[PDB]
RNA sequence: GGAUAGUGGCCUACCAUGGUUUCAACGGGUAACGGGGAAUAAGGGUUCGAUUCCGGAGAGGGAGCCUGAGAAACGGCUACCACAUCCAAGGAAGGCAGCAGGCGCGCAAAUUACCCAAUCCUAAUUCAGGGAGGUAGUGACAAUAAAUAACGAUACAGGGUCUUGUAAUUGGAAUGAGUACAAUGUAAAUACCUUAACGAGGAACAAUUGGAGGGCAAGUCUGGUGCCAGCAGCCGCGGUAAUUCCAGCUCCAAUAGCGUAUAUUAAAGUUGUUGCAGUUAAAAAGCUCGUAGUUGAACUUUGGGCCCGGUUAACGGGGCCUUUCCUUCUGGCUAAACCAGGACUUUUACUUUGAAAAAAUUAGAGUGUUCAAAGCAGGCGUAUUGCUCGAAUAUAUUAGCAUGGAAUAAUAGAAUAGGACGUUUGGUUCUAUUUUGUUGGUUUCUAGGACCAUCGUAAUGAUUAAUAGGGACGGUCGGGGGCAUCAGUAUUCAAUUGUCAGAGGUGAAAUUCUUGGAUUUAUUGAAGACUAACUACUGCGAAAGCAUUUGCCAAGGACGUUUUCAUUAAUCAAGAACGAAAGUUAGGGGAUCGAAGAUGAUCAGAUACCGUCGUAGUCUUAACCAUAAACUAUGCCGACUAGGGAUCGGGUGGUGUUUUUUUAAUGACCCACUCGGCACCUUACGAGAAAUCAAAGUCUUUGGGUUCUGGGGGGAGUAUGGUCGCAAGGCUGAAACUUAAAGGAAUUGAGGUUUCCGUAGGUGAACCUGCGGAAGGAUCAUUA
């Protein structure tokens, strides 16, 4: 069954940016969905989305602009303490300077610098470069 | 896909994205209220009803018009059931294959169907006994269903 | 996917999963069975004594060819009889009958090193003395 | 209750029947004392920790006790077990896992030396004592610094007038390894630091270890030795399964150090959480159900305005309003509502910050121990009465404690309201910090709880209905299953009629029936099995599997639906249902075929190893067994990604076709879609070692959920133990030892020939045969 919605939508966004779309579907949509979408697009990663509303899950239907190599989810969301958050992205991601490995802390979904700007942490989410 | 087969059809019906009246309506928002109630004295189980409301008297779905769903409508007149709907006719479709099986002992094909029908009511039974819809054992058995379905 | 569970509460699973497989190696096997202290040639240990009891003249090929014969030796310890490799010749007629040897490995893990199956041991010293300066002239084998 | 210093089943008497466990209790092994720590440095891990510090236990092995604040003490005692000493034979006495030392064991570890001078401890005590401890002796465990040589002059080879290399060429300058007055050092010595004197010309005062086919650095080096029915013949050449057989020269790497053996760590992604593989290389359970375990759809405060406000126009912080800061109490401004003030998770997980955390060890700051390994020292002066900086700092990934956050993941709340809120009122039930002098009791008011009911106050309380799931209903569909029933020709046999010399069978023969008529032809019957053609790269079933007609019985999938519950679900150790053929125990019937058997001829060749008869079996009933190449050699569920046409089932549409005898429903066909299947052809966008693959893709850019399995080849599915079976056997399942390979995928160069799998019987064995299964076997021709 759908243990994880926000992996079969992070699937299709990659598979629809390798195959080369430029609007990909998304069923079903959550929060979770929609902020990590939110992050990815606030660095430029994806262009810009909408939330069909029909009455039961929702969908989401995202226009992509190029520009993403690789998005992806962490599963299981392991906790992760503030000091181990660079070795998660030393693990994977491209470089020390660009790539952005993405956390569920308390103080919402954010991206690894945000998440050491207010020094703060939380379980992590995913990773998109 | 289905629970104890290879089948993977999505035969399903589709509700319309309107949570209100349809327009050509206009009966009333009461009177079928009563209307289930009596055919509920009939001895008819509320999918007979809804598929007669929706099919004689142009009620789309009973809960868009009158507010609430047809089991709760039966307990609020106090008219439910002492077992739900699904699991009385899971019990008398065990009791039927196994009245079938004890006339005829060499169908193993029956006896795996009747395998796989009693699963589903001791899952169907745990579950109601999870949120103690029935009381907290009610313990399904074998001769005691035959007692059971009438 | 990959069939191990990877829950955040599947620990145990893939706890016991590891050590079953790992039971299945083979220096595992052999550490943790205490095999080296059962049923090694030796006691496990690196070097050991014995006494000599034969030699023997395996040969390489028809006696057109370089002699290449050593001694059957049983433990002091263990009291297990195996067969070792003494060096060169030159060297075969320095040891002797019950002549108080000290054996070491001879470097494959228990596997024969060069064209020699059958023997496991190469003699480091003879008589108590020594066997490679004693080959070189540097000191000589006491009598008894 | 006893006993204990004291709690306590610690023990006793009585009474209950409890307690732990697949979240592994209990039993067993440990070549197991635990921790600080050690090695390995990308991370994560893996292995070690007897051993300088902390804690425990022990004094040859059980057991007991005195004294004392403290012992179940052993450099205390008593007895038992095992060793063992003395003698006058009656008796007495023992405990080095303290320091030296010796025996034994082994691959494996030193002085029967000096002293309390330092550090500390004990005592009546500055004073005595201390094998605690320090000092020296042995000591290549481990570690630091650097000796074995440096500078000229002459002659050659150079680069070419100023720079190198070579020489049985030459010259003097410096020194410590040593030896030693002295002084220092030290408890006293030794040794170090300092130093009068002596001490360098090559066999000085001499450096070693291992290697020179590849990894891996340095020999197109030399000589000698053992062998040849190879050429010549006594000088030799070439070759030697001589794995170089050995010496000399030369070179290489490190250097007071180098090799070897064993164990372990890395490079090793061959243990894989990060991070493997399971079509064909090892490996997806025969199939489905199902408990624990692991995992599980979406939704509930979002947004905006206002300021103040920290650091480099940007990031971070807090307060107000926007229907919004909700809860539990003392005192003041007041007229249930403000302020100064005590604390809060329904119940957690998660994360941030803080504490309290032994030193030594690790990282690291300072500091010229002559550098350094170290050590925690030192530094500057009027160096004649002094001054002064230091002995930091970081980490500890679990548990307990305090705290900020409220995303993520849970969990509980109002459905018979037994729900929340009140200056709406009566009654019950209890207690009084008081005042009636204190106290005991009697009562009222009053004060605070709990309850029984009545009037209200309010938007009065139930999230979608998952291209999740089950359930209902309608019309279908199918070689799905059980029972009954029907048919078909065939085979064999029997009866009746016909007719004459053969018939059978193979490569060739022979047994065999036959002038009582074989074989064949004709009519009829009986038995048992099996369902040809139609039959398809079609259908159904969980898999094995399922093919004549009809009836009965119960089931099922896909489709359709504005039906019904609202997470009921995914995968699953335990446990269960079914499981081809062969096989077992009893009955039935036994047509055909036919393991076993009985016999024919064995002819170089059976390449053509057969023929006839034929039990068990094949079929069935009632019980067992549980395996196959049980194969798609490809677990199951969920998602996305590429074109094309067939085709099965259902549904939707067509001023389409066709059959009614009137062109009305309907059935068939055509067309266009749509859902669900069995497949098919092309391609690489991707993957692969390749064959190839629409999954074997979305994987070094490595994580959707879950179950099983593999760890180089033999030994070996063997031995042993357990369990199940009537048996055959099934499941579970080694080790010692042996091997440097083994395998997969493709291209290029005397005789029997398919390769296997499960099962039963015979056999000189690999073999031969019976039954069922597989391809891991080489598809032309015609048509559409």
């Given amino acids: 069954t759908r243990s994880s919605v926000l992996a079969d939508a992070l699937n299709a966004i990659n598979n629809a940016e390798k195959t080369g779309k430029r609007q990909v579907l998304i069923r079903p949509s959550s929060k979770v969905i929609i902020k990590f979408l939110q992050v990815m697009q606030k660095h430029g990663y994806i262009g810009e989305f909408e939330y069909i509303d029909d009455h039961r899950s929702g969908k989401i239907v995202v226009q992509l602009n190029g520009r993403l190599n690789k998005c992806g989810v962490i599963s299981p969301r392991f906790n992760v303490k503030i000091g181990d958050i660079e070795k998660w ?41 | 896909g289905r629970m104890h087969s290879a089948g993977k059809g999505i035969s ?42 929706r099919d004689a008297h142009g009620v789309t779905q009973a809960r868009v018009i009158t ?44 006896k795996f169907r009747l395998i796989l029908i009693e699963s589903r009511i001791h899952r169907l039974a745990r ?23 009438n | 996917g990959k069939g191990k569970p990877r829950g955040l509460n599947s620990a145990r699973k893939l706890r016991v999963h590891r050590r079953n497989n790992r039971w299945a190696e083979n220096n595992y096997k052999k550490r943790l069975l205490g095999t080296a202290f059962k049923s090694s040639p030796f006691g496990g240990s690196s070097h050991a004594k014995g006494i000599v009891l034969e030699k023997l003249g395996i040969e390489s090929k028809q006696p057109n060819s370089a002699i290449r014969k050593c001694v059957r030796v049983q433990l002091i310890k263990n009291g297990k009889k195996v067969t070792a490799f003494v060096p060169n010749d030159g060297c075969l007629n320095f040891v ?15 596997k024969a090193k060069g064209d020699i199956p059958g023997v496991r041991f190469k003699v480091v010293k003879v008589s108590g003395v020594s066997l490679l300066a004693l080959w070189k002239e540097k000191k000589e084998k006491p009598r008894s």
């Fill in chain 2, 12 to 53: 399903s019906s589709a509700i319309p994205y309107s949570r209100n009246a349809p327009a050509w309506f206009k009966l009333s928002s009461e009177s079928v209220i009563e209307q289930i109630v009596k055919y509920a004295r009939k001895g008819l189980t509320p999918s007979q009803i809804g598929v007669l409301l």
């Fill in chain 2, 127 to 149: 579950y109601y006994r999870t949120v103690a819809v029935l009381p907290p054992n009610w313990k399904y058995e074998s001769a005691t269903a035959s007692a059971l379905v």
């Fill in chain 2, 67 to 110: 507010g609430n769903k047809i089991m709760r409508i039966l307990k609020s007149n106090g008219l439910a059931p002492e077992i739900p709907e699904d699991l009385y006719y899971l019990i008398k479709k065990a009791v039927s294959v196994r009245k079938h099986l004890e006339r005829n002992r060499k169908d193993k094909d029956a």
């Fill in chain 3, 96 to 110: 002797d009958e019950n002549d108080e040897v000290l054996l070491a490995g001879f470097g494959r893990k228990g």
């Fill in chain 1, 89 to 129: 992205t030393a693990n994977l991601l491209p470089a020390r300077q660009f790539g952005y490995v993405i956390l569920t802390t308390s103080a919402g979904i954010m991206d690894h610098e945000e998440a050491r700007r207010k020094h703060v942490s939380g379980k992590i989410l995913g990773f998109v470069y």
